[PDB]
Each structure stands twice: as C-alpha cells, then as structure tokens.
Design a protein around this ligand. Structure first.
Ligand SMILES: COc1ccc(OC)c2c1sc1nnc(N)n12
Lengths: 195, 198
C-alpha cells in the first residue's frame, strides 16, 4: 500500500526522488524547514521511497492506533545526520545502537529544524553540505524522559509491560522526542542545505 | 493473518496456551529440548500467542524472503533467560538494548543457541527462587550469515565497498553454527516458553 504521492519505481523497492522546486510537495517541506532555518541555503529536497521501511512503519502505526484507541500517534520531526550516515538511514532508517542521550538511549528527533541544524547533529561535510531528515515519528502517548532509559517507562508501575510510546524533554511544550524501537520512525524527506 | 491453529483470543492481543503432552506440538519441542538436555525435566511448554509481535515478525520474514530468493531464512533456536525478563519478552520480544554480554562475543546483539544445552546454562536460564529455569523456542530470521566479531552493533556488510548491504545475522562458525546474533527488532518471534527444573 505505497502512498499516492510516490512516483513509479519500475518494480524496485527503493528510490530517492529529487523534488521539483516550486511544486506543492517541495513548498510544503521547504516551509517546515524555513519556519526556523530561513538563514540556510537549500540545495535540494529528496523524497525517500523505501517500501520495506514504509511497510514496517505502517504496521507499527496500525498497532499503535489499536493500542491507544485513537489515531493521533504520528508527528513530523527533524533529524540531523552526518554525510556518512545518510546511505544507512535511507536504506535501514534510524538505529538507536549507532552526542549526549540525556533523555534515554533511543533515536532523537527535534520539533524545530533549528535544533537539528546544529553542526553537532547536521555535521557539515568537506564541501560544507549539511543533511537533515523530515521524519514521520510514532510519538503516540509520551512522558518525560531521563538518562539511562533503554525503553519508555511503564504507563503504570502495576503493569510494568504497558509502556509509553516515546519520551520528551517537556510534556507541556515538547522540543524533542526519543523513540526506542526500530520502525517507529519513517525518514520521509532528506534536505541538503548549507550555512 | 493470525495462524488458524491458535486458540481464539476473544479480540485479545496476547495469551499463553499450555500444551498437552501426547500432542505432536508438545512432543516435538520436548524431543528438540531433550536431544541435548536429557538431564533436566520439563514442567510445562506454553505456546506464545502475541498478535503484534507475530505481524511485525511476519512482515520482516516476507521482506527477507523477497530480498534473498529461495533461502531458508528461518531457524528454530533457543533463548534461556531469567524469570524477571519473561513478562517483557512475552509482550515485547527480544531487545538487544537489554542483551547480556555473551562469554564468547560475536557482536552486540541478541544471542540464540542451536542446542538447548547451551541455553540451559544457569548463566542464561537463571534458576528463579523456586528452582525453575526458563527457555524460549524462537523463530529467528538468520537469513544469510557470516562469522561475527565482538565490535559489531549491526551485521557487517557483504561487500566493504557497499556498506549498507548487510548480512542478516552473524554466527560463531559458518561450518558448524552453534549460535546466532541478531541486531534488529522483530527478527525473532518467541513461539514457546519451556519451564524446566533439575
Ligand atoms: C538532545 O537532543 C538530541 C540528542 C542527540 C541527537 O542526535 C545525535 C539529536 C538531538 S535533537 C536532534 N536532531 N537531530 C539529531 N540527530 N538530534
């Protein structure tokens, strides 16, 4: 069930599709970035078409929609990456096993592109190019994180296996989310940009 | 897509089904165990019916069956663990972030044994306060594998010049595999829980 807005892949399961500047999809993703990163230069935006990652992600979304009995489990977040990690992420998504993990040992995602645009996260390559993903994240029901978590905390210490879906720095006004499982995050767009 | 021989779960997502000695399902697991663990006695064998773990595992299996072409990608392996881990594994499966360092490390992942005797070591199937040991029988997507090494946080590339095209798992020895390490969520389905004693 590959999304409508995807383009034909000639029976292949993986493609990076450069977006056309000035068309709807490009303008949408550009505005989300320029909200907080209007001083950077965008070189290009690519749609990640990974059928395996998409399928595993959609299975987790349908499971979380059943478990939570509601369907607002998804958010659009940012993830800065060094050039050398881009091929891995395009292919295999985000891997907690691969900076400071103050809110737990998972994969980190920023509400604001400004945060992901830090050189510690979006490390400039030899040519000055920085890389940031726009990511669909199953944040689901969340609580405040803490150092050393390997999974989100229990929703009630009387059932230690019924878990929050993610953790955050701040539950009232979140600026980051940590997920602790593979296939809880779909890398949807890659932005290549410069300072 | 839940298997047709599972007990009806009443729209429930999870349950453990106690098996009857004399049924083929119980007897084949007992034979597989006793092949190398003839000194121990089985208390019970439970079929694990976890709808969500099953779906995610079956999606990974279909993807590996597509990627590899006519490989036997699945092996039935053993995993001994402490009583404290059993409720988490039953609900959530095998989390590499929680895995022990193995005495011979072929990578930082979850370890599965070919031989029940290996999983039956007190270091893995730690006796609980009542002297009960716990061992899972696990469908593992071993796929295409190579000899691992202690540094690995994922299986290594098949080809150094193509770093993202990975082996599916690693082993101690490709000639005589006795253990497999997996590095991803939903690559192992816990199918049965063996409770046993001395
Ligand atoms: C404290 O927050 C983080 C810790 C670690 C991070 O990745 C190493 C990270 C954040 S926010 C963010 N956006 N993009 C990335 N990679 N990250």
């Amino acid at each position: 069930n590959l999304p409508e807005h995807w383009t034909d892949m000639n029976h292949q399961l993986f493609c990076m599709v450069q977006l056309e500047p000035g068309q709807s999809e490009y303008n949408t993703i550009k505005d989300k970035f320029t909200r907080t990163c209007s001083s950077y230069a965008i070189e290009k935006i690519e749609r990640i078409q990974n059928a395996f990652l998409w399928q595993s992600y959609q299975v987790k979304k349908r499971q979380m929609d059943i478990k939570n009995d509601h369907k607002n489990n998804e958010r659009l977040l940012f993830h800065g990456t060094d050039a050398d990690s881009v091929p891995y992420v395009n292919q295999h998504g985000f891997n907690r096993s691969c900076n400071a993990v103050s809110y737990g040992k998972g994969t980190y995602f920023a509400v604001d592109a400004s945060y992901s645009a830090k050189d510690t996260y979006s490390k400039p390559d030899s040519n000055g190019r920085k890389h940031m993903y726009v990511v669909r994240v199953l944040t689901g029901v969340f609580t405040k994180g803490r150092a050393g978590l390997v999974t989100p905390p229990p929703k009630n210490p009387h059932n230690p296996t019924d878990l929050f879906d993610s953790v955050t720095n701040n539950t009232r006004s979140p600026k980051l989310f940590v997920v602790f499982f593979d296939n809880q995050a779909y890398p949807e767009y890659l932005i290549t940009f410069t300072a």
